[PDB]
Design an enzyme around this catalytic site. Sequence first.
Site, PDB file in Angstrom:
ATOM      1  CG  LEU A 230      -2.041  -1.023   1.189  1.00  0.00           C
ATOM      2  CD1 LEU A 230      -2.847  -0.968   2.467  1.00  0.00           C
ATOM      3  CD2 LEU A 230      -2.917  -0.769   0.004  1.00  0.00           C
ATOM      4  CG  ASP A 231       0.646   5.888  -1.747  1.00  0.00           C
ATOM      5  OD1 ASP A 231       1.701   6.187  -1.148  1.00  0.00           O
ATOM      6  OD2 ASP A 231       0.082   6.663  -2.545  1.00  0.00           O
ATOM      7  CB  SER A 232       1.934   7.080   2.802  1.00  0.00           C
ATOM      8  OG  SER A 232       2.130   7.976   1.729  1.00  0.00           O
ATOM      9  CG  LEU A 233      -1.856   9.352  -1.155  1.00  0.00           C
ATOM     10  CD1 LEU A 233      -2.596  10.487  -0.505  1.00  0.00           C
ATOM     11  CD2 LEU A 233      -0.350   9.563  -1.008  1.00  0.00           C
ATOM     12  CG  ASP A 234      -3.599   2.870  -0.768  1.00  0.00           C
ATOM     13  OD1 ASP A 234      -4.553   3.504  -1.268  1.00  0.00           O
ATOM     14  OD2 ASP A 234      -2.761   2.248  -1.455  1.00  0.00           O
TER      15      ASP A 234
END
Lengths: 65, 62, 63, 87, 540, 177, 171, 79, 49, 155, 122, 128
Positions: free
Chosen positions: D41-45
């Site tokens: 996952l992204d940090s945005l996720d």
Amino acid sequence: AHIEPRYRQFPQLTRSQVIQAEFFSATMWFWILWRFWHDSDAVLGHFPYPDPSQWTDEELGIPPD
Amino acid sequence: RHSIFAFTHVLIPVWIIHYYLKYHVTTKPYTIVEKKPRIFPGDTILETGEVIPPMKEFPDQH
Amino acid sequence: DKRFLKLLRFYILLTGIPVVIGITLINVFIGEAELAEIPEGYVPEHWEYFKHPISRWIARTFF
Amino acid sequence: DAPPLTLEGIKDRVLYVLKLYDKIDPEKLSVNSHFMKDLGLDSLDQVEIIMAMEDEFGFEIPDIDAEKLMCPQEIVDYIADKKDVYE
Amino acid sequence: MNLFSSLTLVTLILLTMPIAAINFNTHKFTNYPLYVKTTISCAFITSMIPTMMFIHTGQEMIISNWHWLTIQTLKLSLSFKMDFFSMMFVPVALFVTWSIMEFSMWYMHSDPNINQFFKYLLLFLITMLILVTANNLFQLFIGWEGVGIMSFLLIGWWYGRTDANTAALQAILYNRIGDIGFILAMAWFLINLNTWDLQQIFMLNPNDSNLPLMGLILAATGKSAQFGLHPWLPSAMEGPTPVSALLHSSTMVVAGIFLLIRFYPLTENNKFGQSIMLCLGAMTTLFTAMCALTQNDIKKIIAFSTSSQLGLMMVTIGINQPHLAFLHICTHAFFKAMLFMCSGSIIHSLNDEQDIRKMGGLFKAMPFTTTALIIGSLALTGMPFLTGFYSKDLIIESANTSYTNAWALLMTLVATSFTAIYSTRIIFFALLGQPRFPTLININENNPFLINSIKRLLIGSLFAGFIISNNIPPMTIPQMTMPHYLKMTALTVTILGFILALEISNTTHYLKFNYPSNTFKFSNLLGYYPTIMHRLTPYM
Amino acid sequence: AFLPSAAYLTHQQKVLQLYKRALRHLESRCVHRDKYRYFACLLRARFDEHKNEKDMVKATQLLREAEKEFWHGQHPQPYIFPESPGGTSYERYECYKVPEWCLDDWHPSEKAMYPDYFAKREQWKKLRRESWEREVKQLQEETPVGGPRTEALPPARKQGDLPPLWWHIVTRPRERP
Amino acid sequence: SWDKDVYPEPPRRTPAPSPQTSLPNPITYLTKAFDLLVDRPVTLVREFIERQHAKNKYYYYHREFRRVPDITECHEKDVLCMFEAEMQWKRDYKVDQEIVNIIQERLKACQQREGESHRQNCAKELQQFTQVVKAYQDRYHDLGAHYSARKCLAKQKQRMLAERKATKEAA
Amino acid sequence: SKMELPDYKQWKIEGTPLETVQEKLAARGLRDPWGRNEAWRYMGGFANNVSFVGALLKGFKWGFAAFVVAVGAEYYLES
Amino acid sequence: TFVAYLPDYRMQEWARREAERLVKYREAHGLPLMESNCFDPSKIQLPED
Amino acid sequence: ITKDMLPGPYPKTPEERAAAAKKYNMRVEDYEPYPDDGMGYGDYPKLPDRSQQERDPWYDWDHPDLRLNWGEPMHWDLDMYIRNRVDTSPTPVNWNLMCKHLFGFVAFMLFMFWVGETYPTYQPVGPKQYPYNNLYLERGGDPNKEPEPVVHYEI
Amino acid sequence: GAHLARRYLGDASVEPEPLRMPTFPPDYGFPERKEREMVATQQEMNDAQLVLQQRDYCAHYLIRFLKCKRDSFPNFLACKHEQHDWDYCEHLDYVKRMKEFERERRLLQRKKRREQREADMA
Amino acid sequence: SFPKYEPSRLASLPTTLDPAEYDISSETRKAQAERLAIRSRLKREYQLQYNDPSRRGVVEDPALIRWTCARSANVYPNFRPNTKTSLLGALFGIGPLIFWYYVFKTDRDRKEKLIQEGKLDRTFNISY
Ligand SMILES: CCCCCCCCCCCCCCCCCC(=O)OC[C@H](COP(=O)([O-])OCC(O)COP(=O)([O-])OC[C@@H](COC(=O)CCCCCCCCCCCCCCCCC)OC(=O)CCCCCCCCCCCCCCCCC)OC(=O)CCCCCCCCCCCCCCCCC
Ligand SMILES: CCCCCCCCCCCCCCCCCC(=O)OC[C@H](COP(=O)([O-])OCC[N+](C)(C)C)OC(=O)CCCCCCCCCCCCCCCCC
Ligand SMILES: CCCCCCCCCCCCCCCCCC(=O)OC[C@H](COP(=O)([O-])OCC[N+](C)(C)C)OC(=O)CCCCCCCCCCCCCCCCC
Ligand SMILES: CCCCCCCCCCCCCCCCCC(=O)OC[C@H](COP(=O)(O)OCCN)OC(=O)CCCCCCCCCCCCCCCCC
Ligand SMILES: *C(=O)CCCCCCCCCCCCC
């Protein structure tokens, strides 16, 4: 039994709350249409508003010169 | 002793307040002054018995 | 706080209830006076010009 | 009103939300499925996951605690820390 | 005489008895809220007998029972006025209070300060019945400052919160600025008419009463949240929902209007004061009903609703139709307390949710609350032959068909449209559509306290407007001749409000995001008046 | 800016806080959930257009005009959660949050109403007054010179030590007293 | 009991009850219930109290101040006479205050008792009220908080000089 | 005390406006990650909710029925 | 109890009862209820002019 | 507590400024006092005059309602900038523009009520005609005198 | 509501101003016009305690309606005949006021034609 | 492009629009770390007295005590007469006294000229 807490779904309905809500909704519409049938005049109008232009000069007393 | 709420909150206060209003308030002038009752033509007075005469016959509109 | 309020109610009612009962018994049994016209020749006492008995006792004893 | 929560209930509800997420599979997902090193996952996720937690349990996690919950079990522990469960 | 004055004073002494019960306690109670609720029930049942023997005989009296003080020309007695205003408003307020306290036995059950809450709320009821039965301005100042201070203590109920304390200090600031004018009125009457009693004021009948009527308009501006002194009523929703429901809908905020209604033999001989009341009421009912439309907190919306209805009351005093304004008080009480109780049941069932943007799906899920909220919203709009009809429709008809300011009448009609707009806004974003509340459903409304308490105001909001408007004796001549375009002005504007707000509601589902204009930024920040006058004036 | 442990916000932290505030104010503007979800993925594409930006001048400048886009495109009244600052329930129950030391001043008859609670409480007070000097000597040996840099407190290290300055963090009152 | 000659109350005229409708009113049944349950036991208790009054009857008196010479016939700076003049004037001022209060009670009771026809049917009470306020304003107004018989006499003399000047300039 | 959850597999977004959102995101090359987290609001008992014109007319049916019965009873009652 | 039963504190009850006596006296005798002059104008000498 | 942790007179040399900035427990470069004008501040620092509402609420503060710390040099109007009082928080619309909007709307509405009073509306009817010389005795006329005949005829 | 646009956008002289009207004499144009009759006696409506705005020429219908409402209690729906009599007679009084306004307006039209004939003839 | 926000005194400038927040220079790092240092020192020294069970009293705040001493005690030695203090003491010390003085004197002279001409309505004024 009280209303069990539910998750992401429609809550438990008692028979009594739904029949009371429907009974008071029907009682509201019964009252509205009941007074609408018995009165019919507090909304629409009571007495015919006359036309001031259609009045003759005889009944208004306007001697012609 | 089931409905002693009304007995201790109305019927004894109605006793106290009516004793007050009957033997200390009405005994004094102009404490309880009343708007006199609305009199109509054709009525009968309970005090005198003088009957008010009625109204004139109407110039009927309908 | 409850101890203060209980003692406050106690030490007020301790002479409140006997004085209330005494005033009630004076009003029932001794009672309010009646206004009379002053008789000729009779010069009343200063405490006799008051309607309630407790007021008469205050005017007679202290005042 | 205000039903009492448990660690089991917080755990099951957080994992139930995370099984309703499309970049997380419901078969690799465990109680310590770290969102950066494991789940891809992204940090945005991560920010979307914490915002879904806030929309889930109905209280705002501040950013200085939002940016540090890196596993589901830290989220369970932080909601237990801010809701006082198993009193 | 013997029965009327007896039950008159028995209702007041009966309401004072639970204050003695809470002040003389030792034990923890066997449901002292049930005790206060049963007291208010039997006080209502007692006070309906003077109402019935006023409807039959037209009997009124004054109970000047207890001499208190005599300042050389002013015999201040404990003087009660049992007139049409007292006879109609005391059972209405007792009924609404009995509904709010059986609401509060459920909604405030999680409170260990429940006995203090019911003590404060009964103290408010006692100060309001001092206010509405006062036959002199000193006792009316007692009741006035009593509702002001219990407004303080019930807005600042959850007192650790800074917002409640700030709203309570704000409320006291605006009420005391109204008290400047009320003390101006009392000063004018003592210096010029040598009385505080209402009877000598009405008998002497002063002519140059511009200054005391400006004082009374300032007092009603402070109390009824008119323009200039309105923003405490938005902030005042930070108290409990039954506090706003009882006080700031039906009972407290009508007291400035009720003060002006009390002095109608002074307003009927002054065109200047009525022009000021009409201009201020139309300004208020434009501004507050506009600011109601763009809010999301449901208690803010219903507070701007009741302030717009009070601006309508100020209008229909300013057209010199006072008994219709008092009928609008006795009408507005039922359904606005019921709409606050429905909004509060939505708050409780959604676990302290006051915002309309996290509602929805409560049509079927909360059927009785949705039913009674639609009924309250229709009674607020002026649905034909509900309780709101017999007041508000006649107010619009007598405002059109009389000597009126034209622009004030047009603002009254724009307000009439905006009422329907926010009413269906509450119905749509609260009841209709799909749910927006979080996933743990604790929707429940199965308590006989809640159901019976909304049920009694529901019977009221259906039948009571008809029953009151056909039981009271008339006091003016009702204008009942007007054309089709002028008789049907109110319902046409109401239906246009419905259709235009439904088009606004259908624009909420289109997938286009538009940048907000200055209209929404003006109305959503409440017309910028809590932004300027709260940051600038305390700094000065 | 102002944080307890860190002394600043990084650029990445500013971007995440702007993303979170932008979605919350979007949910404010876009009330219904499908419409919010559609514009939410549109905004997700808007933020992920510049996810891989290695020029920190260009990244900070895109952050700056994204802040200006947010500042022109925000709602005056966002949805605040009620127990959050600005809500309709924030610091409401602080009128019930009576601290723990007021139990020490009770009359002993109403301590005799809860015997087991106060007997259980005195061993907490005992454990605190024995752990206090141990955690003072834990702090005074680990903290560097000139005062500590961060406000991050250290934990306990031994089997018998409790973490330093642990009383008002554990014995805080509940959120529903 | 008070005197009806100082507190005038007109003969009341109540209408006879005319029930046209077939439903009974609640007010007659509640009046019977009141007159049996409350009006009779209170009267019994009052008769017991009245018997306990009549077993010991005694009387109080209204105090009579015989008229001492007033300030017009007291020497200047002679306290033994103008003391009695000042006490006489203060008792008369207090009684005049209560006279104005009695006429206000008449006015307010008339306004309530006549109701909506108060502006027509209370012209005599309003006229007497205007006269007694005119006399009280001419007698005691604007004397100040240090009011005395000297201030009242000086106000009366200034009023009489104004009246004499206005009468003499009309001839 | 132990609360039983519903299934995570029964909440599918197909047939809901989340699926319409998925179509309108696939129209310009996107993908929605949070559909099944929101799809319960458009299913179950909360789906197919009434509009405003019918929520007004709640009780219009039996209200008009009892109105017709009462009009018939009062018109047969005057005779 | 003492302040409650003061023996006609500052003679206000006496003053009302005396006002009742005076108005009852001078309503029957056709006299005005209050003169505009506190003292008799026959016993006041004016300064000459 | 003693004298040198209580405020003194105005600092004029830089080393007195350094000692004063050590006293108020802040950086010397952050330290800026009020100007020595005689209005009565002394060495007390001219803090940047922000309200306490602007601060981070989620922080573990020392003073939770005040949003303030221990040893932090407090603002001179700290009692004035409590959250029960004056706020300096940024608003969406500017202060000048909000004042213009509110004053323009107030003046517009008051002008329109003035013009509507200047041009009043009415209904096309006559006067409401009353008998008995327009109710002479009922409005308070005296019975011994007699008014003019106010007589209305049939139309 | 068209008369406001006739008095504000047209002329004001041919429109009768409501604050002082009638300005024409009532006998001007009415040969042998009879007076208005008051049915309820002044002592009757003084006993009836009617409001001063209610004491117009047709107070007797209101006296009958109030006597009905006093005499039909506790039935508050037994006096619609009397209420309709009173409201219809108030309708007739409102129509008479309309006829007074229209009389004044057509006589101002007559004076306008008179002055236009004088300006066009001499 | 967009409306630039104009900061005011009663409505200040936000952090996220202020240009000094995006300074990543080393002196800003040194300033933020020294403010962190003094803030952490005050936090630690406060909680060493705040958590001590032997203390049972008031943790004295020399900031708060210093503020209350500055508001009340240190006024007088730093009060010096200049242009600013003398002019503002003349306008805000005796100015509104002069304003309300001439207002009430004008009102009472007008009312007295009315009363001794008998022009003022004073028909029922007998309580003064
Ligand atoms: C119970 C204990 C409670 C607690 C006690 C302790 C209290 C605390 C300590 C106090 C210490 C003393 C303090 C100083 C005060 C002293 C007393 C004093 O100055 O009294 C003054 C004053 C003058 O008394 P007085 O000068 O002695 O008598 C006047 C006459 O000269 C002479 O008058 P009279 O001779 O005619 O009166 C005689 C009277 C005796 O006199 C007294 O009682 C007076 C002494 C008591 C005064 C108590 C005052 C204390 C405060 C009381 C109120 C608060 C209590 C707590 C709260 C309760 C809940 C509200 O006789 C009776 O009472 C007998 C009648 C009983 C009536 C009820 C039952 C009747 C029917 C029975 C039927 C059954 C039998 C049928 C068959 C029969 C066959 C034979 O007395 C009162 O004011 C009495 C109080 C009640 C007044 C009326 C109350 C109702 C008013 C309603 C309208 C106004 C309010 C509107 C409110 C609106 C909303 C906010
Ligand atoms: C509920 C339990 C009560 C206690 C139990 C035992 C007693 C029960 C009572 C039984 C009946 C007793 C006899 C009747 C009572 C006494 C009768 C009597 O003559 O009383 C003398 C008098 C009656 O009035 P009065 O005119 O005779 O005396 C006035 C006093 N002088 C003349 C000296 C100025 O007093 C009372 O009755 C007092 C009643 C007070 C009721 C109201 C309380 C108000 C509290 C707030 C105060 C502030 C008000 C501010 C506003 C003022 C207006 C603007
Ligand atoms: C005194 C000057 C110095 C000031 C400092 C004093 C300090 C020292 C203190 C010494 C003792 C106290 C002295 C003052 C005493 C004054 C009291 C007194 O005597 O009063 C006489 C007054 C007398 O009333 P009155 O003036 O009508 O006199 C009647 C005259 N007699 C009795 C002779 C017939 O007492 C009362 O009024 C008592 C009546 C009973 C109590 C009142 C009934 C209602 C009670 C409240 C009910 C709830 C109301 C609503 C509120 C609800 C909640 C908000
Ligand atoms: C019929 C005539 C009608 C005329 C109408 C027009 C005239 C009246 C106009 C209004 C006058 C009063 C309004 C101005 C003051 C408002 C004060 C107030 O409400 O402050 C609120 C403020 C914080 O509240 P707020 O910010 O809204 O809360 C949300 C979360 N922050 O709270 C605070 O900041 C706390 C402030 C406490 C200290 C206040 C000190 C200033 C006091 C000023 C007194 C002014 C006296 C004016 C007298 C006039 C006499 C004629
Ligand atoms: C002319 O129409 C005279 C009536 C009064 C002036 C116009 C009033 C206009 C507002 C009432 C009708 C509104 C209909 C939407």
